[PDB]
Amino acid sequence: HCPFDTLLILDFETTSDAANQDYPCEVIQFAIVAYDVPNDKIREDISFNKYVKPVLNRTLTKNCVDFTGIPQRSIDTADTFDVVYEQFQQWLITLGLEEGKFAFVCDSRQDLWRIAQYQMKLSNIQMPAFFRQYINLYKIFTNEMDRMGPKELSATTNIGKMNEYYDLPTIGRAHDAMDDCLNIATILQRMINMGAKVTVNELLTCCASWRRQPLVYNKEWRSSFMDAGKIFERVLPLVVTTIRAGDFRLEMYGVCRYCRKGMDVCGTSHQQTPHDLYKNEEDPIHFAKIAGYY
Amino acid sequence: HCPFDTLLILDFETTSDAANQDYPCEVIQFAIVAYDVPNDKIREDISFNKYVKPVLNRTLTKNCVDFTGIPQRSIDTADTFDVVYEQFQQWLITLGLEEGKFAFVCDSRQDLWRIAQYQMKLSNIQMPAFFRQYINLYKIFTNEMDRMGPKELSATTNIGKMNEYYDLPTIGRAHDAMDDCLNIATILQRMINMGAKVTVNELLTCCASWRRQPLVYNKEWRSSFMDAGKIFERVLPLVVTTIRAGDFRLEMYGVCRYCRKGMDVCGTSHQQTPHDLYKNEEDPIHFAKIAGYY
Ligand SMILES: [Mn+2]
Ligand SMILES: [Mn+2]
Ligand SMILES: [Zn+2]
Ligand SMILES: [Zn+2]
């Protein structure tokens, strides 16, 4: 039994400029589809789907438009994140859910660890408890592949992979956040029926001991998604810690896995500020500066 | 030949996204170098050179930094245009060149007709007289070739063609505004030494009979520099009109060539608003929308 009655599949799309990783991503699409656990039903009549107007980079680069297929008129016409995120909160209450008895599900750590946290620094919104614990479905998927036996996967995204492996047709268009959500809900549902144990497996914590030793800087990092990741890790206050299925307990919402304080008192402030990175303004980190991490 | 005692070579560099013409260019570099007409001397010691921080698109596009060579750091520490423009105005005063007896010199109509006009709208500043009267050096150059003997030119930018024609070494790097300035300055000097009459040949006007005809809309304009130009001509209030060297009189300064009101009056609102373009709603013009052209 998965211990949540209802699972919320979330995906964002953001602003980007492909060849440049020192980029202050802003949310441009915010999508959710609800999943009924005891009933095993994807409920796509219980949705959230909004576009979002960025403030830092108002014009979407052509390559971003290409990736996401989101046309510029759709963002010009949208509200800013603070407004949209507010609508989100109202919509949540609409669902009459029991605090801590529902979890978000994403295709990776990107959506909540990186995207949501950063956007929320910008919009100056404290990160809520239900974003500080979630189900990284792809990680679960790695385990399911061990159990059920490896397979040759030519697909190129986390979703693509899971759809290929589970032998599921692609829903709609890649990188539309809602379409991404629909693929993940289907994947999740097939996963549960094939025997996957689905719980919270990632927690956002204020502190990790691998951040005490300054990071081995790598000059060409703004051209590598991996290496950018490593610096994203140092800059963002909250870092992803993992947790074994059998170790998770419902009542961990919403206390910090490291410092055990409440999530209205933890992460108002970086606990391992990477001063070592911020000391040479011959090569400064752009996304850290506009966000105001220094 | 030159009725001015001082010539200010001016070049701008802007934000951009190569493949997309429907882009709200903001000034990121502002460069000027003075040329002392009577002594025929370039004056690098009398120059202005500021980077400028954009507000609509704050993170330079990778191809933008590739094109211009401006690193993101130079703009994150820079001032916003409104501030820099005020510095410019101050600089002018302290050099105490008498308005009406200097003129700006550019490599094309781009700097003042497009770039300056648009940015001034963004920054909500009335177009000054000295931007409404200028020397398009390239225009003089095509007449000079006509007078002396055309030759085969392989270079693609205007500065490139002029350097190649007058057989001059490229100064610095292309698309650094200040370097562009130094090139233009050397081209001008040579032009003059070869007997060219260098005087204002382009004026910004409120109105033009050719704009009375609605523009035959090319649906793929956003990916063609030339067809974008057409759109840009209909949106921006002021239009380029040319004037023969024989006709220009110094006291045209501050007086609109078309309507004859003073430029305190002429300019404040669009005389030929392109309403025909602005009705298609599943295909809106982004740069117009963002600047408040509608
Ligand atoms: Mn997605
Ligand atoms: Mn230039
Ligand atoms: Zn904590
Ligand atoms: Zn006029």
Q: Domain coordinates of chain B in residue numbers?
A: 1-199, 200-294
Contact residues, chain A, for B56 at CB < 8 Å: 58-59
Method: X-ray
Amino acid identity at B73 = R
Rounded CA separation A138/A123 (Å) = 28
Contact residues, chain A, for B62 at CB < 8 Å: 17-20
CA B128 to chain centre: 13
What is the DSSP-derived secondary structure letter of residue A108? S
Judge contact between B155 and B162, C-beta under 8 A. Answer: no
Q: Which ligand is nearest to the CA of A241?
A: 3
Q: Could you give the C-alpha distances from B185 to A67, A155, B127, B146, B174, in angstroms and in order?
A: 43, 55, 24, 21, 14
Task: Answer whether B17 touches A (CB < 8 Å).
Answer: yes
Rounded CA separation B2/B6 (Å) = 9
Judge contact between B36 and B95, C-beta under 8 A. Answer: no
Q: Is B25 annotated as a binding residue?
A: no
Nearest CA in chain A to B222: A62
User: Looking at CA atoms only, how far is residue B284 from chain A in angstroms?
Assistant: 7
CA nearest to A105, candidates A206, A214, A182: A182
Nearest CA in chain A to B280: A73
Q: What's the order of all strands across the beta sheet hosting A79-80?
A: A79-80, A41-53, A27-36, A6-14, A102-106, A133-136, A202-205, A239-242
CATH number belonging to the domain at A1-199, selected among 3.30.70.940, 3.30.420.10, 3.80.10.10, 3.40.50.150 = 3.30.420.10
Tokens of A62: 């052509």
Rounded CA separation A34/A4 (Å) = 12
Run of H or E residues at A80:
strand A79-80
Say whether B283 and A73 touch across the interface (CB within 8 A). yes
Task: Answer whether B71 touches A (CB < 8 Å).
Answer: no
Tokens of B227: 């067809």
Query: Resolution of the deposited coordinates, in angstroms?
Result: 2.8
- The vertex-B148 CA angle with B142 and B150, nearest 5°, equals 60
Rounded CA separation A250/B52 (Å) = 52
What are the two backbone dihedrals, phi and then psi, of residue B13, each rounded to the nearest 5 degrees? Answer: -125, 145
A67 contact partners, CB below 8 Å, separation of at least 6: A16, A18, A175
B76-99 b/e (C-beta count within 10 Å ≥ 16 → b): bebbebeebbeebeeebeeeebee
Judge contact between B199 and B2, C-beta under 8 A. Answer: yes
CA nearest to A77, candidates A60, A64, A94: A60
Task: Answer whether A224 touches B (CB < 8 Å).
Answer: no
Judge contact between A91 and A106, C-beta under 8 A. Answer: no
Say whether B59 and A23 touch across the interface (CB within 8 A). yes
Q: Could you give the C-alpha distances from B107 to A264, B66, B141, in angstroms and in order?
A: 58, 21, 10
What is the DSSP-derived secondary structure letter of residue B210? G
Dihedral sign for Cα atoms in the order B21, B25, B28, B32: positive
**In this structure, are strands B6-14 and A6-14 parallel, antiparallel, or unpaired?**
unpaired
What is the DSSP-derived secondary structure letter of residue B1? -
For residue A248, how many other CB atoms are within 10 A of its CB?
15
What is the DSSP-derived secondary structure letter of residue A151? -
Task: Answer whether A66 touches B (CB < 8 Å).
Answer: no
| Beta-bridge partner residues of B30 | B12, B50
